Symmetry: C2
């Protein structure tokens, strides 16, 4: 592991503070701007939609990525939640009420066993079964996100290969002739400190770079800086153009 404090410029330029953790898969080498915050664990919030999707798929509570999840009819703050969704759009728009249905269906016993199978963070599901990744006991660090994502990438998590392929498809965020990004955002607000997540990887022709970032996020108005700052680190390191 190697610390590169020059990435802090990208945080300072935007009156922000956080961590970016990169992992070069071919070279088995890690880079971060803050080794200690790289290993600090937070609530995963929306990034928990990755393991939650894996478990729901594996147990059959979600049949596939085409299955339609009917809006429960309750109007909520976020406009894109007040409609039908499938797994692709539930991930894309981070639709909490859908994933809370999953968790309630999965249940505490199976959720706990699956998080141990995944070595997911501190593997603690204490709290409400339908909200523990937002205000319960589960905590995961940026480096632990990468360890989790590396196993997902190689289909080595303890669920079906099909489940892992469907979720990696649902993580599709961006793709062009130079790279593919599969990733998931999160915004943890129910328990201080308010932080924003972006975790995933960028696939190149010849390599895979895993990334996990979090930053202090007192207001939702800075949420776009998660991707902006990450991408500026990726550009500085010549990973993307």
């Amino acid at each position: 592991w190697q610390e590169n404090k020059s990435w802090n410029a990208h945080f300072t330029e935007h009156k922000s503070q956080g961590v970016v953790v990169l992992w070069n898969e071919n070279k088995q080498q890690g880079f971060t701007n803050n080794l200690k915050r790289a290993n600090q664990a937070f609530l995963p919030a929306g990034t928990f939609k990755i393991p939650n999707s894996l478990i729901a798929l594996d147990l059959g509570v979600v049949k596939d990525e085409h299955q339609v999840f009917k809006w429960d009819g309750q109007t909520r703050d976020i406009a894109t939640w007040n409609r039908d969704h499938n797994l692709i759009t539930a991930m894309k728009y981070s639709v909490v009420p859908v994933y809370q249905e999953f968790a309630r269906q999965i249940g505490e016993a199976r959720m706990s066993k699956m998080l141990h199978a995944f070595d997911y963070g501190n593997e603690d599901i204490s709290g409400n079964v339908d909200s523990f990744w937002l205000d319960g006991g589960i905590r995961i660090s940026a480096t632990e996100q990468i360890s989790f994502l590396r196993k997902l990438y190689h289909n080595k998590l303890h669920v079906s290969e099909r489940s892992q392929r469907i979720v990696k498809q649902a993580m599709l965020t961006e793709a062009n002739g130079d790279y593919i990004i599969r990733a998931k955002t999160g915004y943890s607000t129910r328990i201080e400190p308010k932080i924003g997540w972006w975790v995933g990887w960028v696939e190149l022709d010849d390599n895979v770079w895993f990334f996990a970032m979090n930053m202090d996020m007192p207001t939702s108005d800075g949420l776009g800086l998660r991707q902006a700052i990450t991408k500026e680190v990726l550009k500085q390191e010549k990973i993307i153009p």
Copy 2:
């Protein structure tokens, strides 16, 4: 089906000639600028990499999309061919020699049987087992490409679901917050008429639009008009921004 020569307008702007065929999956409605040319069958050339990939995976000729096809050591006229590849980069760079090896390992009996199971065009593999899609008897139309791609999208082809998912992964061309394009190019030169292909689909939040286009390509510096003209059609019909 609906004819729409308003799109011809975009073939004149570049004084090229061809056909674009769109299929609205939700509405079950087809659209084309040239009803007659939509049903004209051509050599598939590089678009055959889709069914060839499916068959090689289903039969175990390709274990997965990480498996490395080592360069045979013959320097060819296309620099990206002169290196190692996996399924992802083989598709991306239309690496013909890689797919020739697949075809030889598949054999002409199993290939024939699979193309019948696929309803792939005229289902005729006459010619060399390792080049018939470039200079043999196989012929497929733009509308027949759509029928084939619709089956692949829904995992309804007579191969494992896993094979179809891997191939759809490998078809990934472009993705942003508005759409996802999975597609494959092709350039048929060995037999007249010289035509270029682009076939695939556009995934939206609430719909998928299948497309298949071909056009006269006397020389290969007009190749970029395959994607350029197709998008002009998609932008006109408000499918993509």
